[PDB]
Amino acid sequence: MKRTYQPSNRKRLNKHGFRSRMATANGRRVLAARRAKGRAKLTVSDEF
Amino acid sequence: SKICQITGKKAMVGNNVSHSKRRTKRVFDVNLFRKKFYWVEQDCWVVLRISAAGLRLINKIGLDAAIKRAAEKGFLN
Amino acid sequence: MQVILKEDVVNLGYKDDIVTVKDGYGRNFLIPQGKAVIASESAKKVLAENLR
Amino acid sequence: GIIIKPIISEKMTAVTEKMSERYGFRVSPNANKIEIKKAVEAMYNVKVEDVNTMRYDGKRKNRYTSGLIRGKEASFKKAIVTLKKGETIDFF
Amino acid sequence: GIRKLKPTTPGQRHKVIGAFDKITASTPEKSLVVGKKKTGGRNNTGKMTMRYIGGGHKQKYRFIDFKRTKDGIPATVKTIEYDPNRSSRIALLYYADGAKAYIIAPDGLEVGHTVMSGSEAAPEVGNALPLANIPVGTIIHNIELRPGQGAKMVRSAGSFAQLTSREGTYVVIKMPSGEVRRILSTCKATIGSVGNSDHALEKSGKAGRSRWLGRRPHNRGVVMNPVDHPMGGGEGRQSGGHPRSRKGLYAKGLKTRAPKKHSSKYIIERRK
RNA sequence: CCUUUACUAUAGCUUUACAUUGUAUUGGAUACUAACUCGCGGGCGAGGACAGUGUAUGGUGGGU
RNA sequence: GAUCAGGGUUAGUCGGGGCCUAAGGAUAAGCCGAAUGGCGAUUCCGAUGGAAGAACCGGUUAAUAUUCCGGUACUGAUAC
RNA sequence: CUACCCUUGGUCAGGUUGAAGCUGGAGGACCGAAUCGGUAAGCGUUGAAAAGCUUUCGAAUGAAC
Numbered sequence: 129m130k131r132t133y134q135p136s137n138r139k140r141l142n143k144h145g146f147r148s149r150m151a152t153a154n155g156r157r158v159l160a161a162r163r164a165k166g167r168a169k170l171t172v173s174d175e176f
Numbered sequence: 177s178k179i180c181q182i183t184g185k186k187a188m189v190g191n192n193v194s195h196s197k198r199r200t201k202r203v204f205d206v207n208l209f210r211k212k213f214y215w216v217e218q219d220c221w222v223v224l225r226i227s228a229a230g231l232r233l234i235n236k237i238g239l240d241a242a243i244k245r246a247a248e249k250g251f252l253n
Numbered sequence: 254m255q256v257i258l259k260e261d262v263v264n265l266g267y268k269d270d271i272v273t274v275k276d277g278y279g280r281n282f283l284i285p286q287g288k289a290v291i292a293s294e295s296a297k298k299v300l301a302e303n304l305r
Numbered sequence: 306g307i308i309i310k311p312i313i314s315e316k317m318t319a320v321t322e323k324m325s326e327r328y329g330f331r332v333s334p335n336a337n338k339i340e341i342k343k344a345v346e347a348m349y350n351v352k353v354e355d356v357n358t359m360r361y362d363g364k365r366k367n368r369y370t371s372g373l374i375r376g377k378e379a380s381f382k383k384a385i386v387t388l389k390k391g392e393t394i395d396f397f
Numbered sequence: 398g399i400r401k402l403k404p405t406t407p408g409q410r411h412k413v414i415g416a417f418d419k420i421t422a423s424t425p426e427k428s429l430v431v432g433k434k435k436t437g438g439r440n441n442t443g444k445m446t447m448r449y450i451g452g453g454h455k456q457k458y459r460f461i462d463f464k465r466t467k468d469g470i471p472a473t474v475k476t477i478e479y480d481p482n483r484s485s486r487i488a489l490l491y492y493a494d495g496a497k498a499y500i501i502a503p504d505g506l507e508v509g510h511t512v513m514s515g516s517e518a519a520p521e522v523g524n525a526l527p528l529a530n531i532p533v534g535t536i537i538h539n540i541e542l543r544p545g546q547g548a549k550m551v552r553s554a555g556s557f558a559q560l561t562s563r564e565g566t567y568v569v570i571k572m573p574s575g576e577v578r579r580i581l582s583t584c585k586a587t588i589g590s591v592g593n594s595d596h597a598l599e600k601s602g603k604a605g606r607s608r609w610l611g612r613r614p615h616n617r618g619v620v621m622n623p624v625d626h627p628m629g630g631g632e633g634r635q636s637g638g639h640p641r642s643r644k645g646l647y648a649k650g651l652k653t654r655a656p657k658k659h660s661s662k663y664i665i666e667r668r669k
Numbered sequence: 670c671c672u673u674u675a676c677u678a679u680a681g682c683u684u685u686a687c688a689u690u691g692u693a694u695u696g697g698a699u700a701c702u703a704a705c706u707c708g709c710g711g712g713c714g715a716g717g718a719c720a721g722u723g724u725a726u727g728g729u730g731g732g733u
Numbered sequence: 734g735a736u737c738a739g740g741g742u743u744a745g746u747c748g749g750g751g752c753c754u755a756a757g758g759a760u761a762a763g764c765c766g767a768a769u770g771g772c773g774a775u776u777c778c779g780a781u782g783g784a785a786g787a788a789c790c791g792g793u794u795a796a797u798a799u800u801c802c803g804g805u806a807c808u809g810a811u812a813c
Numbered sequence: 814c815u816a817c818c819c820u821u822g823g824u825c826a827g828g829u830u831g832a833a834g835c836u837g838g839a840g841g842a843c844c845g846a847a848u849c850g851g852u853a854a855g856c857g858u859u860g861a862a863a864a865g866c867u868u869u870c871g872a873a874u875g876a877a878c
């Protein structure tokens with residue numbers, strides 16, 4: 129059967145990528161929380 | 177910006193109060209409108225966004241002194 | 254609203270005089286045309302002169 | 306520092322054994338074909354006639370510890386250089 | 398002016414379509430058409446504000462000249478064309494100087510006629526004149542509300558209005574709805590009726606034709622749940638109470654014209 | 670969570686008063702144009718102290 | 734198709750990209766709004782579409798092949 | 814993922830019938846593969862599968878996929 133995750137690299141970066149996070153105040157708020165935690169992976173732009 | 181340019185007046189936050197004393201948040205808005213003015217000293221026209229209270233000051237001390245007073249306190253910018 | 258009539262005006266008149274009008278009559282008709290000027294102390298002193 | 310090292314492999318030795326003017330180097334991954342022709346000609350003093358290129362990403366080398374410590378070798382670019390017919394190069 | 402289909406299939410049994418007999422050309426003018434984008438009833442925020450809109454055939458928009466400003470320059474009717482954007486037909490005009498335009502096709506206007514606009518133009522079918530220069534009792538369409546703005550009223554297929562009286566700076570006009578109101582005499586109108594009067598005799602025949610026209614199925618309120626509609630709920634079929642909309646607006650006589658609109662000064666008799 | 674002629678509120682709609690808001694004739698109407706509003710083209714039209722808006726106020730208000 | 738090491742992907746034309754615009758997105762002048770901001774062009778971005786620049790058959794390696802070699806073509810720049 | 818919508822692309826073996834205008838070739842027309850579904854029965858129920866398989870069945874030029 130068709131499952132929930134059907135990958136598309138173009139969709140992934142448009143929805144969760146680094147440049148989309150930086151485009152809004154609430155996205156930059158997410159980046160600040162992940163930096164303060166010390167995450168090695170900041171966005172999906174890192175795993176690529 | 178919904179601010180008067182002569183007085184600086186802006187909306188204030190208050191309550192609606194019913195007869196049972198239920199209190200709900202409300203806004204008291206400014207009687208704010210746009211009006212065109214003839215400026216005798218400069219021989220021109222200007223359009224200001226002022227309250228009815230600002231118009232009262234204009235009609236007491238004159239337009240020219242009102243703009244000078246408004247620019248000192250930082251209302252016209 | 255106190256104004257200085259710089260011209261002879263229908264009904265209320267006798268130019269160069271102290272007259273009181275409603276704020277709408279002065280701000281919107283007399284001043285924009287140029288038959289009156291607002292009466293401030295800094296303008297009523299310039300009218301205390303008559304030298305006639 | 307364009308040229309990193311020549312290529313001495315089984316495939317390249319056979320290629321040279323057929324085309325005597327054909328050699329292959331490892332070069333910086335961000336160098337273009339025009340630059341590479343300049344470097345091989347300014348160091349071996351030859352007439353380069355044609356350059357072909359390919360880009361290799363490095364091989365991943367995932368070890369295990371307490372697991373999945375990823376590793377990777379540096380990426381490189383391969384340049385296959387053809388000299389003017391009648392010229393050679395000696396790596397010794 | 399219509400064509401009734403024979404009952405070969407249950408979907409064709411009750412279908413009636415137009416004969417397309419007034420049409421003289423098959424394709425539109427290149428300089429007067431542009432591709433037209435579809436809304437699904439969504440506004441600029443992306444939310445669906447109007448239901449039951451969606452799908453249908455791709456359509457190009459045609460530039461219709463509702464102002465008729467080329468006053469004094471004669472024009473000639475070249476072709477009569479199909480237009481998917483409106484219920485009436487349209488006519489292509491070549492002006493004597495090189496301009497081209499589309500106008501709503503009046504009933505009785507045919508290829509090879511000459512049309513004109515202006516105050517010094519003959520009151521003939523397809524001519525645009527100010528109401529001041531239009532005789533009393535005439536049949537007219539494409540009525541301006543303001544001078545210089547452009548035709549707004551009486552434009553649908555088969556529609557017409559009659560100029561009944563003159564009142565100085567205003568005329569009196571009876572509208573298709575039965576309302577009687579005063580119009581400014583410097584406005585403009587076109588003589589005649591709007592054509593394609595047999596457009597109201599068509600029957601789609603099947604649900605599929607509605608979808609070609611861009612309409613989506615419409616659900617009754619009594620077959621929903623109370624959370625979706627005030628008329629919903631109940632064990633078995635229920636009436637749903639007083640007819641009202643999703644926001645609770647009475648649907649059986651509530652008047653919605655603003656009772657202090659200024660145009661009420663010009664409305665002499667009302668039917669709407 | 671849902672319903673309503675349960676209670677108490679409330680968005681919205683609607684009434685009047687004050688402000689915006691003036692002038693004549695004869696209060697309350699009629700009339701005007703300069704506040705204010707809309708259209709054309711790049712001033713001319715059409716309205717007009719109404720309308721719209723702020724504050725206060727009565728009514729309505731399972732839409733919430 | 735596991736562990737370790739070595740090796741292996743070759744383009745003027747192929748597929749992209751460089752050019753163009755759709756839905757939509759970001760904006761300019763402006764408009765709106767406790768703040769954070771919301772809107773807003775003929776502007777820009779954005780292919781799943783349009784390009785007036787152009788290649789096809791065969792053979793060779795353990796692993797590449799309109800890319801290497803053979804044969805036969807085509808398309809831009811540039812100098813005389 | 815799913816519901817609906819917008820822009821831009823693609824797909825639908827074979828046979829039959831015979832509307833408007835002997836010819837003609839329409840249709841939310843017929844039979845039937847691909848395909849989209851999911852009628853009935855059997856099986857599975859620490860399953861091969863957190864919804865399937867086999868047989869059977871519906872639609873298959875359209876409100877289609």
Ligand SMILES: [K+]
Pocket residue numbers: 615616617
């Ligand atoms: K229904």
Ligand SMILES: [K+]
Pocket residue numbers: 623624626627
């Ligand atoms: K409800």
Ligand SMILES: [K+]
Pocket residue numbers: none
């Ligand atoms: K289904």
Ligand SMILES: [Mg+2]
Pocket residue numbers: 355
């Ligand atoms: Mg080559």
Ligand SMILES: [Mg+2]
Pocket residue numbers: 358359
């Ligand atoms: Mg390459």
Ligand SMILES: [Mg+2]
Pocket residue numbers: 620621622
């Ligand atoms: Mg039900």
Ligand SMILES: [Mg+2]
Pocket residue numbers: 632633634
């Ligand atoms: Mg019952």
Ligand SMILES: [Mg+2]
Pocket residue numbers: none
């Ligand atoms: Mg409740």
Ligand SMILES: [Mg+2]
Pocket residue numbers: none
């Ligand atoms: Mg191995």
Ligand SMILES: [Mg+2]
Pocket residue numbers: none
């Ligand atoms: Mg190409």
Ligand SMILES: [Mg+2]
Pocket residue numbers: none
């Ligand atoms: Mg562009």
Ligand SMILES: [Mg+2]
Pocket residue numbers: none
């Ligand atoms: Mg292979």
Ligand SMILES: [Mg+2]
Pocket residue numbers: 799
């Ligand atoms: Mg080949």
Ligand SMILES: [Mg+2]
Pocket residue numbers: none
């Ligand atoms: Mg069928």
Ligand SMILES: [Mg+2]
Pocket residue numbers: none
């Ligand atoms: Mg099948």
Ligand SMILES: [Mg+2]
Pocket residue numbers: none
């Ligand atoms: Mg059937």
